[PDB]
Scaffold this motif. Structure first.
Motif, mmCIF file in Angstrom:
data_model
loop_
_atom_site.group_PDB
_atom_site.id
_atom_site.type_symbol
_atom_site.label_atom_id
_atom_site.label_comp_id
_atom_site.label_asym_id
_atom_site.label_seq_id
_atom_site.Cartn_x
_atom_site.Cartn_y
_atom_site.Cartn_z
ATOM 1 N N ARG A 59 1.375 3.392 -2.580
ATOM 2 C CA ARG A 59 0.708 4.491 -3.257
ATOM 3 C C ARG A 59 -0.163 5.184 -2.230
ATOM 4 N NH1 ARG A 59 1.014 5.179 -9.065
ATOM 5 N NH2 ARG A 59 2.932 4.579 -7.957
ATOM 6 N N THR A 60 -0.997 4.420 -1.553
ATOM 7 C CA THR A 60 -1.858 5.017 -0.566
ATOM 8 C C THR A 60 -1.100 5.748 0.513
ATOM 9 O OG1 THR A 60 -3.546 3.399 -0.893
ATOM 10 C CG2 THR A 60 -3.515 4.622 1.187
ATOM 11 N N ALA A 75 0.802 -1.218 0.000
ATOM 12 C CA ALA A 75 0.000 0.000 0.000
ATOM 13 C C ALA A 75 0.844 1.282 0.000
ATOM 14 C CB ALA A 75 -0.933 -0.008 1.201
ATOM 15 N N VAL A 81 -9.812 1.936 1.558
ATOM 16 C CA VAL A 81 -8.627 1.569 2.333
ATOM 17 C C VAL A 81 -8.961 0.383 3.245
ATOM 18 C CG1 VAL A 81 -9.036 3.201 4.232
ATOM 19 C CG2 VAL A 81 -6.744 2.387 3.816
#
Lengths: 802, 802
Positions: A553-554, A551, A574
């Motif tokens: 990018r997040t 994760a 998410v």
């Protein structure tokens, strides 16, 4: 879930419409026992037994059977099961995974099917994750069983070679997933029938099915014992034989044997210095150890049959002559060559018996389990255990606060929030269960609130009794408990006095797990019987799982939007993400186990063949039909190997065959060319046998009429066992070998099957050959006791992971 | 196979001890019909039917049922089945693969179970590999059925939209593996119930089970029709909408919709130039095509929701924001963006319906098949079709010459030997069948003997009748036949007049195949009914299979030992090698199909959900319960999306919700904030529905009391179908996409499952949403006919390989 996508809940709907009704029939006849003396009730158990062998099926008595139990429990424990409970019961009887939200009464619910089934003394195993829980359970839920007049035996590894038979005798047994497993295995090492502890596996009921059937079933169960420091006599064999080459030890190329009978100059030379006159006893130890070495010199040539390197003696295929993927010569010939080639004779600790949990719980005629979380790993079951997961309703509707995750940017920052949460939760007097994932994280949040001024207590597996005890008072006003990974499964948390009003048990998850269940169990530690509660999972952006799911990018867009300034933050894209990612982990673990089982699946086609044959011997009236059959079996192979496909009709090397049968089955001068000359393989096999039997008779007549049996049983066991243990190690060896050098067209699992089955075939033929020989050329002396096949210490264990 | 390794033949032993007995009971009562009028016999068929619905089970009548058939055949064809035949019959009834050596009477044997089962008019399909065989069969073995008074229908793709219903009506149907398959599919495109040709799939009997169930099942079956050259109106949509941006077309972010009702300035602007007044008909074609484009501009932003490259518009995940593995936006939104981004709007030929043979033959309540070779691919069945392979004895003991392979060094050198073999075999007057592997190799050995001076004839699949005809006279004195890959399966070779003495049919295999069966079938073309024969497989060292197995070492040691000078050479460590290698090929093909089925297995969890729901609609009394249910379903999602997890209790954007329900379900000014203000989601959903229904009523009252149904059925079909076909293509698309870019932690098959199920969920919700809207805001005009969902030409086909 109303809508077109409702046809998915249909397979379980008609099943729930059923069980719900069945439960109504039980509560429908709650009068027949409501006001009835204990005596008549207790007698109802027999009325049932009587009805069974009188035509009725277990199902036919379900409604009533249960009723009696439902009643009996109100008397014994003051508890009258709820409809749901009755429903879970039926499910368990049907052979399914009864998923009843953590907080109901499974340990009680289980009584119903375990009783209705136990009413035929065929055996009913109720397996638990640990000995304590299994203990406690048996005691409390036992009274119910004993009341209806049923024997309940407990089963712990601390019980004796006598206690456990009794415990297994009872019509309702309590044990752990390992005990039952290891016993099955020790039961197949048994030299004397009566040493077997278990009875034929009938019906099993698994509490915490996920733990036992899935988690604890990622690795196989296995027993093994190191090999004697006897790297002294192997070389002796090599040294001995290294000075015999001559036609005084007859070799063979059609059957590739270095037999020994008419090799008196050898059988006498063998007696350089040992109990020369005696054979039977230390000859099975020598011969089987000497010939393997003798064959290592005369039969197995060097750079043609096998290859040598700075490693172990690698084998070599005939066809493509490629290097085998970590394989050894069975029966103990491999390390005999190591003596010949001088190469280090690699002595290890071989395996003795082994089975995968998956394959174990599949043996019982019927299987079933109970837990509060199964849908998570639902397809696992249906696929591997052909069991369905039936989600049973809750006694009372659930009204608990399943608050959405709270994502945090700072790892050591979220804890400050979590630690604070418990702080105020505590100050209000409301109880709290902070669930973690790792010890390092639990002790951190521990000291984290010590300096905060809050009383608490961590959960160590010192002993489940210690954990259980803590959990008990985990719902009281001053409650503040730290559970590593659910330190208490069975022991449920009963709301404290007053907590009902303060709110409820506030369960707060530190981090988030890999599989949704392990934390679905945690999250479920509240809301017992409609109780009010609040669950909250805190999740960090540095959480090892975020790094595990990729994760990043997040993690970026979150720092690119000044979010790391607003402490708390909820989000679908998410949380609905951290779940889909978890499914992938759950889908992999399943592939693993499925990959594991398949490999074992090969053994389980082999185990039964040897086990039924071994047990058949271990426990038999007459053994001549067996032994003979094996002989005629070893004879066909012999005769056949001398009569290939029309290679010169009556011009086979007949004169040679006679020389083989003589110095292998009969005596130096028995069979004659004449006796065979002209008859086809069919006739020959029959003929050669007719003298083998008529001779076999002299043995029963000479040395013993029934002493023969005890003579057979020993050689067939010191054979079948000697080889098997060897083979089982070879398999549990080459399995890992292939994993590396393997660019063949087929997949590794296939080769295992392929080569494995072949190996299995060489052992069987070997078992027979050896048996057929000793029963003849081996004369009895004094000691005629079935002798073990492994030196002292043998351990029981299950790999951590791998 | 006598010996310890005999416990493997046990699972089939008790089964063969049974069937052999059953067969004895039939021959035991051969008097009850021996001397009995045709009338009473023919009437026995009814006595049976009468006994069935009177309590008796199909099994209960087996012994007699068969008896009658055994008898009836002696009358019809002069053939009284042999015990084995009766045995094969029972097997087939039990749902197993009856393996009866090629040469017995399966086509006859099949009569028994196909009859006993057909005695309840539930349907019985007897499937063949090709239309001819299936034809011939039905005619000859039909007389037996018709005699006992049973209708037999044939089924060929040349039969009409009316003929085939009849053919399927008969109580015993004949068809091909494809026909039955394709029909099932066309039966789910049907707009009007009666257009369905098939009846519920009952019991199937597969002749040549291997061919149909395995070989022919390596690739899936599928129907599809190219997309209209209409790359003209898509851009029009883009061009139209590219000039509307305003609050005159209400957007949505909580539900992400660009709805249209109170957007009169738009619904009127939509009518720039087309049949403005009319909706229903060409509005379902526009709206569903316009909104997807409208949403492409207002909702789907560029470099955030999707990415663009010199290829197609790739999607992008939310979490790791990684590039999706070849996936498109369903419902036809994907190519709407291609208009927006200008990028080439890639128009193809989408799939319509599809299923894997594996999944097809699993539908029939019971399944079974017959052939002379199954053990080869034995585990394939037990695993995929839960069928066992029962090898049935031979009428008469086999006494044929199964000569060992003859290995040759020179490829073009062995043929000289083979060609010569047939030459002398021929000159003696004995018949000969030279089996090959490839056409190039068969024609070579053809001209190879033309110059040798020998008459012959090759086998082309011009038409199985032509092949069959040749085979017939393939056992006569001048016999010399060249069969490519067994040009005649069914048509058995009857020994010629005198051939019995000359020796028999000498079958000589050119090369050796990949799977042992394909050549086990060949090798079996001799020895019919104990007939004497000679089979010989010639094998070269340049044989493409040797190069495929990697037998280079063996090729070396053979030239290193001056062997290439001694023409013929037999060897175990080479033939027992070419087999073990073949097993590896057979083990791979199985992994393939097993890999194929698993992927389809996802669709088959989707197909049934849509098919049962589609059929349910296609054929229904009242449709309001369906349509309504879907509405309330689309309403919960709506209401729910406006009432997230406690995000501001009664402070949800309530005023907005009212604006949604109004311009989506009811009318511009219907629902009021007041009507919702205060009630929980439960109450709301119920309330909003109560006006949706009370309104729904006005529709039945206004436009039509029963004309409503025909109004519902059209929109629910032009919806469910429109989307489904789209989705089915998306799946048959991304399956290959993932195969490439895929270094994710999980395996590809998993992702398919994962993402697939998600897609399936978006379509269902879409189906509902669309349905719920039209049933309300769409007013009826004139044409109220269920309209198709695909332009003209649609093809049926099965991929060659891939």
């Amino acid at each position: 879930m109303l809508g077109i996508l409702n046809k998915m809940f249909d397979p379980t709907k008609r099943t729930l419409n059923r069980y719900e009704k069945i439960a109504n029939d039980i509560d429908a006849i709650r009068g027949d026992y409501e006001n009835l003396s204990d005596d008549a009730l207790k007698h109802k158990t027999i009325e049932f037994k009587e009805r069974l062998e009188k035509g009725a099926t277990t199902d036919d008595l379900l409604v009533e059977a249960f009723a009696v139990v439902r009643e009996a429990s109100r008397r014994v424990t003051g508890m009258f099961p709820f409809k749901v409970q009755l429903m879970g019961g039926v499910a368990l009887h049907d052979g399914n995974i009864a998923e009843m939200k953590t907080g109901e009464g499974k340990t009680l619910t289980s009584t119903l099917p375990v009783y209705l089934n136990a009413l035929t003394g065929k055996g009913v195993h109720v397996v638990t994750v640990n000995e304590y829980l299994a203990s406690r359970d048996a005691e409390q839920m036992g009274k119910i069983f004993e009341f209806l007049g049923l024997t309940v035996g407990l089963n712990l590894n601390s019980m004796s070679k006598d206690e456990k038979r009794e415990a297994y005798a009872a019509d309702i047994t309590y044990s752990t997933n390992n005990e039952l497993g290891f016993d099955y295995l020790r039961d197949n090492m048994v030299l004397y029938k009566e040493q077997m502890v278990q009875r034929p596996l009938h019906f099993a009921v698994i509490d915490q099915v996920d733990s036992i059937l899935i988690d604890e079933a990622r690795t196989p169960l296995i027993i093994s014992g190191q090999a004697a420091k006897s790297t002294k006599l192997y070389v002796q064999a090599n040294a001995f034989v290294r000075t015999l080459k001559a036609e005084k030890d007859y070799t063979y190329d059609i059957k590739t044997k270095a037999v020994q009978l008419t090799e008196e100059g050898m059988t006498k030379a063998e007696k350089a210095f040992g109990i020369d006159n005696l054979f039977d006893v230390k000859h099975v130890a020598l011969n089987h150890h000497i010939n393997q070495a003798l064959k290592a010199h005369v039969a197995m040539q060097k750079d043609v049959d096998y290859v040598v390197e700075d490693g172990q003696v690698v084998i070599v295929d005939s066809f493509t002559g490629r290097l085998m993927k970590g394989r050894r010569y069975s029966e103990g010939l491999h390390q005999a060559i190591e003596a010949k080639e001088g190469l280090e004779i690699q002595n290890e600790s071989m395996t003795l018996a082994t089975i995968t949990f998956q394959n174990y719980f599949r043996m019982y005629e019927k299987l079933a389990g109970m837990t509060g979380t199964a849908k998570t790993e639902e397809e696992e079951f249906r696929n591997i255990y052909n069991m369905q997961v039936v989600t049973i309703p809750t006694n009372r509707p659930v009204v608990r606060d399943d608050r959405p995750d709270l994502i945090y940017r700072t790892m050591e920052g979220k804890f400050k929030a979590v630690a604070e949460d418990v702080a105020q939760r505590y100050m209000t007097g409301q109880p709290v269960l902070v669930g973690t994932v790792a010890v390092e994280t639990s002790e951190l949040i521990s000291k984290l609130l010590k300096n905060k001024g809050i009383p608490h207590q961590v959960l160590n597996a010192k002993n489940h009794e210690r954990e259980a005890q803590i959990i008990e008072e985990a719902g009281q006003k001053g409650a503040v408990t730290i559970a590593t990974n659910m330190a208490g499964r069975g022991t449920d948390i009963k709301l404290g006095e007053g907590v009902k009003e303060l709110g409820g048990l506030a369960v707060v998850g530190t981090e988030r797990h890999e599989s949704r269940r392990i934390d679905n169990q945690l999250r479920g530690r509240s809301g017992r019987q409609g109780d009010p509660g609040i669950t909250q999972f805190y999740l960090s952006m540095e959480d090892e799982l975020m790094r595990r799911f990729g994760a990043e990018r997040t993690m970026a867009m979150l720092d690119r939007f000044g979010m790391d300034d607003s402490t708390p933050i909820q989000s679908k894209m998410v949380s609905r993400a951290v779940e889909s990612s978890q499914k992938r982990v759950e889908g992999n673990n399943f592939d693993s186990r499925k990959q594991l089982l398949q490999y074992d699946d090969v053994l389980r086609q082999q185990r039964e063949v040897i086990y039924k044959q071994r047990f058949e011997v271990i426990d038999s009236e007459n053994l001549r039909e067996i032994v003979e059959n094996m002989i005629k079996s070893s004879l066909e192979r012999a005769i056949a190997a001398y009569t290939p496909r029309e290679e010169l009709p009556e011009e086979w090397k007949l004169d040679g065959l006679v020389d083989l049968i003589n110095t292998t089955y009969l005596d130096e001068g028995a069979l004659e060319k004449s006796d065979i000359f002209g008859k086809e393989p069919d006739e020959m096999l029959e003929l050669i046998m007719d003298r083998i039997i008529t001779k076999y008779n002299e043995k029963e007549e000479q040395f013993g009429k029934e002493q023969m049996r005890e003579f057979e049983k020993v050689i067939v066991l010191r054979a079948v066992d000697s080889k098997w243990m060897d083979h089982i190690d070879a398999m549990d060896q080459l399995r890992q070998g292939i994993h590396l050098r393997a660019y063949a067209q087929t997949n590794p699992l296939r080769e295992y099957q392929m080569e494995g089955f072949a190996m299995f075939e060489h052992m069987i033929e070997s078992i027979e050959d050896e048996v057929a020989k000793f029963v003849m050329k081996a004369e009895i002396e004094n000691n005629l006791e079935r002798e073990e096949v492994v030196q002292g210490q043998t351990t029981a264990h299950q790999p951590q992971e791998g």
